[PDB]
Amino acid sequence: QSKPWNRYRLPTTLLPDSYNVTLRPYLTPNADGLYIFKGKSIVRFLCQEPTDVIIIHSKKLNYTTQGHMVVLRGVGDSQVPEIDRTELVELTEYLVVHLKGSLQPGHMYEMESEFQGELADDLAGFYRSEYMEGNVKKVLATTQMQSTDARKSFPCFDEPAMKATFNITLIHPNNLTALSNMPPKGSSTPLAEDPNWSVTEFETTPVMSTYLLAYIVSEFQSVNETAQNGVLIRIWARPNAIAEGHGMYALNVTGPILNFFANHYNTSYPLPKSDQIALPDFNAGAMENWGLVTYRENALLFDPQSSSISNKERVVTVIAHELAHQWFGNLVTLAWWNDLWLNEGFASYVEYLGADHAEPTWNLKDLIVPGDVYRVMAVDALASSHPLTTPAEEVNTPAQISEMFDSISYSKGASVIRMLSNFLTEDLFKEGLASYLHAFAYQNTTYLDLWEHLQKAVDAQTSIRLPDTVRAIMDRWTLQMGFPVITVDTKTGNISQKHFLLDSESNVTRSSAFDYLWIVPISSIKNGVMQDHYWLRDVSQAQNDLFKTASDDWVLLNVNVTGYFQVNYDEDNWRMIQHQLQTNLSVIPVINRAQVIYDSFNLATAHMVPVTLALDNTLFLNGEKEYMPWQAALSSLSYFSLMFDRSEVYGPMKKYLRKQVEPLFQHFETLTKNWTERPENLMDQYSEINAISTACSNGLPQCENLAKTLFDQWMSDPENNPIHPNLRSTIYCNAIAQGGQDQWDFAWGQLQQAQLVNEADKLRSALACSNEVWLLNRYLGYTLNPDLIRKQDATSTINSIASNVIGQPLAWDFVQSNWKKLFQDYGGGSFSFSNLIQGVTRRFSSEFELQQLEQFKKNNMDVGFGSGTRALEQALEKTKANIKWVKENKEVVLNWFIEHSS
Numbered sequence: 001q002s003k004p005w006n007r008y009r010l011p012t013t014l015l016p017d018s019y020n021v022t023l024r025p026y027l028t029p030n031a032d033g034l035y036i037f038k039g040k041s042i043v044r045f046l047c048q049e050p051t052d053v054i055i056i057h058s059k060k061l062n063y064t065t066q067g068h069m070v071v072l073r074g075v076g077d078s079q080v081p082e083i084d085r086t087e088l089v090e091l092t093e094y095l096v097v098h099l100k101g102s103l104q105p106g107h108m109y110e111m112e113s114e115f116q117g118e119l120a121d122d123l124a125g126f127y128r129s130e131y132m133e134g135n136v137k138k139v140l141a142t143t144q145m146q147s148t149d150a151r152k153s154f155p156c157f158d159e160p161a162m163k164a165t166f167n168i169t170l171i172h173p174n175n176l177t178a179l180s181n182m183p184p185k186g187s188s189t190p191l192a193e194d195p196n197w198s199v200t201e202f203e204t205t206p207v208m209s210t211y212l213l214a215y216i217v218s219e220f221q222s223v224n225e226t227a228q229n230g231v232l233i234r235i236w237a238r239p240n241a242i243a244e245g246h247g248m249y250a251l252n253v254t255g256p257i258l259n260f261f262a263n264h265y266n267t268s269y270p271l272p273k274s275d276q277i278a279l280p281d282f283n284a285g286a287m288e289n290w291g292l293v294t295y296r297e298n299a300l301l302f303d304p305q306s307s308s309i310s311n312k313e314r315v316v317t318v319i320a321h322e323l324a325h326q327w328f329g330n331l332v333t334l335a336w337w338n339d340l341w342l343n344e345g346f347a348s349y350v351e352y353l354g355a356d357h358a359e360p361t362w363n364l365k366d367l368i369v370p371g372d373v374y375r376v377m378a379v380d381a382l383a384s385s386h387p388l389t390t391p392a393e394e395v396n397t398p399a400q401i402s403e404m405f406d407s408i409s410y411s412k413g414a415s416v417i418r419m420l421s422n423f424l425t426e427d428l429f430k431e432g433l434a435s436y437l438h439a440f441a442y443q444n445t446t447y448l449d450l451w452e453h454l455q456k457a458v459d460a461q462t463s464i465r466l467p468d469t470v471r472a473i474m475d476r477w478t479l480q481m482g483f484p485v486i487t488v489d490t491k492t493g494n495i496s497q498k499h500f501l502l503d504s505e506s507n508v509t510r511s512s513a514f515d516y517l518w519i520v521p522i523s524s525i526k527n528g529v530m531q532d533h534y535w536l537r538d539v540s541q542a543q544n545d546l547f548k549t550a551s552d553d554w555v556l557l558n559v560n561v562t563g564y565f566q567v568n569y570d571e572d573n574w575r576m577i578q579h580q581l582q583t584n585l586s587v588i589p590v591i592n593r594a595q596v597i598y599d600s601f602n603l604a605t606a607h608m609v610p611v612t613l614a615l616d617n618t619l620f621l622n623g624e625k626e627y628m629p630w631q632a633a634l635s636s637l638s639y640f641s642l643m644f645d646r647s648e649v650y651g652p653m654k655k656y657l658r659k660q661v662e663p664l665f666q667h668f669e670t671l672t673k674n675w676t677e678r679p680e681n682l683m684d685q686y687s688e689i690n691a692i693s694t695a696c697s698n699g700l701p702q703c704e705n706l707a708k709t710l711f712d713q714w715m716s717d718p719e720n721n722p723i724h725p726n727l728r729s730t731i732y733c734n735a736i737a738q739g740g741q742d743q744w745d746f747a748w749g750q751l752q753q754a755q756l757v758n759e760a761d762k763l764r765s766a767l768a769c770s771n772e773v774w775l776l777n778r779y780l781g782y783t784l785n786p787d788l789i790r791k792q793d794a795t796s797t798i799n800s801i802a803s804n805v806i807g808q809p810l811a812w813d814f815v816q817s818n819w820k821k822l823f824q825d826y827g828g829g830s831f832s833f834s835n836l837i838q839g840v841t842r843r844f845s846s847e848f849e850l851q852q853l854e855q856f857k858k859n860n861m862d863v864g865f866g867s868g869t870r871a872l873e874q875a876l877e878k879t880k881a882n883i884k885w886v887k888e889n890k891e892v893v894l895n896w897f898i899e900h901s902s
């Protein structure tokens, strides 16, 4: 046998009941410049099986407990064994208490410790975050436990299923505010040892997981509202953020969203209050700590003067995401991190539901398709993907746990759960979900528990009939990786499925229980009229008349892309759809208008249609007003841009896109009353933004003139920006493209004095749009200087230059020459060498350029490559793919564009 303290998973001999935890951050450095925090904790736990060892998590804590590292007491009249010795096992992150005798089952024990750790700027555990308010560097103390960092703040049984109540006390400077999961018990009281400090005790948490604990000490302020049921809602942020009104949007939506979910889930919000807090530079994005949710500022705050509609969308959906967790994840928690996908996939899905409640005119639900479905299909159509489900026994280390937080888990998880809600109907899904939430409140589950409760709801009715059990169906989508292409020959109605890969030559080596066969829910529209629902069983091939067409009829599968699959047809059926989109596109749901574009470009890639068929599918766009189909086009073509914008192909391409987009431009010119007013709802605003970007970047004189007039106008009155935030990135970029140092210098001016991140970002990116070599080179020489350009912005800025066709060879030469600077900013930030290499080499598509990257690599001697060591490999391999793709495609594509651009 091996010793239990050398195993990554905790024993189950001891289960926690309740913790007292007192934390004291020191926000002034101890002058060798170390920031510390101090803590004291008591954990009460119950013995289940006799054991003579107590194993508890601890990470980067020094112990100052009197005696051994802990003190051990019996609860009530329980005797307690003596401690032999206490030791720290770093690898498995344990504090280990060896006893002279055994603990007894049924008995409770209390274990006290005193400790301290660094209050580091590391976004891990109890940590510090520094930021500026005017002249002053400010410093606050805040938490991020997710996933395995609670143990970094205090010793605890730090696994999600080992839930307990927590009594939190903060000791803090007496003019700072202290926040935790729960409301404060009463007024803070002064610390007897030193009254410059106060003591804030918090009400007992519900039974909960360690990874959801939070506590924060800052000078933040709040805007507040009391929902009618008395639930207090607060948005917390920097004093000046609050004073400028930047919390108001979050406050507006929060109440409705919470309300939506309590009714959605059929389960009262389980806490007396909900705080949400905007943190500067919170690189982890957002965290759903129960009752105190943390966001990065640009995820929670919104400035109506400067922020764009897409910023607005980000805020409402992120809030909805974090709030969804307050039932799903927090109230009912997955037993182990192998099932993370459920939790994050669920939030990643219902975020759209919650947000749509708050903004019911925006059609937000649609956005899951481009946002999650097609996003994750790009990576799930690879031989190198993985199942949603991982065996529990394979997820053990903190690193292994971290690896669970990826595309597949969030976006595929969202996609397959959306599929499941749709084939069950939402009302039925809701019932099973309510049943699951009530049965498991304050406890832990596996995905099998959700299947079961959905089955119960299925079994309790007669309307929805399935081809198999919920579990049997969802097993197809959770235990094997990837997804099928579904191919329909409409001449016969034959319908087949195969595992879909973008690379037609790939060897899949990961085996499946099911031979990569799925049970597939298939909706279909024929001549614009909904057909009966069909299930493809787990067979390669089948036949149904649902999919048989006459000559002048058409059929289209997967309405609204609710199903996690792509569709191909015979060529005839494609053409009819094409002609339908030509003559009355309204017959076909906007989402499917996009599907046709997304799928066919993917199929073309996989060599299952000719690329010209995919391009034909763009032809209808000249009469398309709606956001999504255009977005499908723009997303699928950006690679064609990457590959061809230095080639003879480009002129025909631009000319084609000018042709396609001009009417959309004209449409918005009228609609927006000469551009003075924005369109009403989100989708039409998104469309306007894309149409303007596309027009301008392709050289439509009408868009070029707009951008010049507007940027001219702004320069003649710098305090009154005439450019709506929706149009800013395009108008800036185009106008700087047309202009010289007059335009460039003014914008640089505006970068240096902008106080808002979203706006600085746009200026930084537009400045890279110059068409003067000398301006792009001078700009490059700024990117390293941290006076002029922040380091965290340095490689991003170099990539934006690379992105400019003229800046490509400039960036590339610059990176080569100052590569000697792994040994200066591998020492001063992480940097992301990996993202730089990717961005600057992504256009490479010739043998000559592959010779150049190979020739670059042979500075292997010293220097090295740090983070992008395998990012270079991926560069040399991606270039090989591009060379192959360009030789196969250059001619056919050139002539398609020549032909279709008047």
Ligand SMILES: *[C@@H]1O[C@H](CO)[C@@H](O[C@@H]2O[C@H](CO)[C@@H](O[C@@H]3O[C@H](CO)[C@@H](O)[C@H](O)[C@H]3NC(C)=O)[C@H](O)[C@H]2NC(C)=O)[C@H](O)[C@H]1NC(C)=O
Residues within 6 Å of the ligand: 020, 042, 110, 167
């Ligand atoms: C975890 O923290 C809890 C809160 O601090 C502890 O419970 C508190 O214990 C306090 C003293 O140990 C009690 O305060 C007062 O003590 C005086 C003695 O001077 C007594 O007369 C009273 O019982 C009490 N005063 C009043 C006004 O009630 C608190 O009663 C008590 N707080 C509670 C129960 O909410 C836990 O004991 C601590 N856990 C462990 C294991 O140490």
Ligand SMILES: *[C@@H]1O[C@H](CO)[C@@H](O[C@@H]2O[C@H](CO)[C@@H](O[C@@H]3O[C@H](CO)[C@@H](O)[C@H](O)[C@H]3NC(C)=O)[C@H](O)[C@H]2NC(C)=O)[C@H](O)[C@H]1NC(C)=O
Residues within 6 Å of the ligand: 032, 034, 036, 037, 062, 116, 117, 118, 119
């Ligand atoms: C938890 O305990 C650790 C071990 O005692 C502490 O780590 C020690 O911190 C010292 C600085 O605080 C480190 O510096 C050494 O000592 C003095 C600084 O006061 C320097 O002059 C020496 O140059 C320096 N020695 C070296 C080799 O650089 C010690 O390095 C370090 N000891 C160890 C073993 O790591 C932690 O600070 C302590 N943390 C908290 C938050 O209490």
Ligand SMILES: *[C@@H]1O[C@H](CO)[C@@H](O[C@@H]2O[C@H](CO)[C@@H](O[C@@H]3O[C@H](CO)[C@@H](O)[C@H](O)[C@H]3NC(C)=O)[C@H](O)[C@H]2NC(C)=O)[C@H](O)[C@H]1NC(C)=O
Residues within 6 Å of the ligand: 248, 249, 252, 302, 304
């Ligand atoms: C949180 O919700 C509030 C209430 O629903 C929103 O408050 C509305 O803000 C609107 C945007 O400025 C205001 O509407 C327009 O204001 C301009 C300014 O002079 C006028 O031209 C328009 O006529 C006017 N429109 C209307 C319908 O009045 C509203 O004054 C205001 N409505 C209310 C009830 O106060 C908040 O904007 C919203 N906060 C955020 C950040 O979204």
Ligand SMILES: *[C@@H]1O[C@H](CO)[C@@H](O[C@@H]2O[C@H](CO)[C@@H](O)[C@H](O)[C@H]2NC(C)=O)[C@H](O)[C@H]1NC(C)=O
Residues within 6 Å of the ligand: 018, 019, 020, 042, 043, 044, 165, 166, 167, 204
């Ligand atoms: C955290 O605080 C709570 C309540 O303030 C404590 O719960 C009490 O536990 C004691 C001893 O088990 C019981 O006598 C009371 O019934 C509990 N009160 C309530 C309201 O439940 C809890 O013990 C504290 N945790 C620790 C570790 O002390």
Ligand SMILES: *[C@@H]1O[C@H](CO)[C@@H](O[C@@H]2O[C@H](CO)[C@@H](O)[C@H](O)[C@H]2NC(C)=O)[C@H](O)[C@H]1NC(C)=O
Residues within 6 Å of the ligand: 028, 136, 175, 176, 219
């Ligand atoms: C809380 O008290 C601290 C200490 O008096 C204040 O922090 C000082 O702020 C001034 C400028 O206002 C700085 O120049 C000092 O260096 C600060 N001292 C330290 C140790 O940081 C702080 O402003 C007060 N905060 C609030 C919200 O009132």
Ligand SMILES: *[C@@H]1O[C@H](CO)[C@@H](O[C@@H]2O[C@H](CO)[C@@H](O)[C@H](O)[C@H]2NC(C)=O)[C@H](O)[C@H]1NC(C)=O
Residues within 6 Å of the ligand: 262, 263, 266, 267, 268
């Ligand atoms: C959870 O859903 C249940 C069951 O649908 C709700 O109870 C229903 O409430 C409506 C509202 O008036 C009544 O018309 C139904 O007759 C009720 N059904 C039953 C069985 O009581 C319940 O109120 C919801 N609870 C929460 C907390 O949202």
Ligand SMILES: *[C@@H]1O[C@H](CO)[C@@H](O[C@@H]2O[C@H](CO)[C@@H](O)[C@H](O)[C@H]2NC(C)=O)[C@H](O)[C@H]1NC(C)=O
Residues within 6 Å of the ligand: 015, 161, 162, 163, 335, 440, 443, 444, 445
């Ligand atoms: C993890 O969750 C399970 C349930 O999913 C918990 O087991 C339940 O415990 C409660 C209270 O002890 C009982 O009412 C049920 O009968 C139990 N159901 C079971 C055992 O299947 C389990 O206690 C949780 N694990 C931990 C460590 O808390």
Ligand SMILES: *[C@@H]1O[C@H](CO)[C@@H](O[C@@H]2O[C@H](CO)[C@@H](O)[C@H](O)[C@H]2NC(C)=O)[C@H](O)[C@H]1NC(C)=O
Residues within 6 Å of the ligand: 489, 492, 494, 543
């Ligand atoms: C449609 O599906 C059926 C299979 O069920 C195919 O018809 C069979 O094809 C084999 C191939 O040699 C014949 O030998 C069988 O006699 C056929 N079975 C029949 C007619 O019942 C048919 O080829 C498919 N059509 C396609 C893919 O276009």
Ligand SMILES: *[C@@H]1O[C@H](CO)[C@@H](O[C@@H]2O[C@H](CO)[C@@H](O)[C@H](O)[C@H]2NC(C)=O)[C@H](O)[C@H]1NC(C)=O
Residues within 6 Å of the ligand: 363, 366, 530, 559, 560, 589, 590, 591
């Ligand atoms: C496909 O998606 C569209 C939205 O893009 C759905 O249309 C919405 O349906 C709801 C209720 O039927 C309406 O309240 C919305 O206002 C509709 N929006 C639009 C823009 O039409 C459509 O119902 C979906 N089709 C199917 C068959 O599920």
Ligand SMILES: *[C@@H]1O[C@H](CO)[C@@H](O)[C@H](O)[C@H]1NC(C)=O
Residues within 6 Å of the ligand: 505, 506, 507
């Ligand atoms: C896949 O295996 C085939 C033969 O089974 C081989 O020709 C090919 O090189 C392999 N790999 C790729 C990535 O195509």
Ligand SMILES: *[C@@H]1O[C@H](CO)[C@@H](O)[C@H](O)[C@H]1NC(C)=O
Residues within 6 Å of the ligand: 528, 584, 586, 587
């Ligand atoms: C286009 O089809 C829509 C929906 O079927 C219909 O309402 C509209 O009248 C049609 N218009 C034309 C010109 O065919």
Ligand SMILES: CC(C)C[C@H](N)C(=O)O
Residues within 6 Å of the ligand: 146, 284, 285, 286, 287, 288, 344
């Ligand atoms: C790393 C954590 C902040 C992740 C969080 N649960 C999210 O998905 O937003």
Ligand SMILES: [Zn+2]
Residues within 6 Å of the ligand: 288, 321, 322, 325, 343, 344, 347, 348
């Ligand atoms: Zn989440």
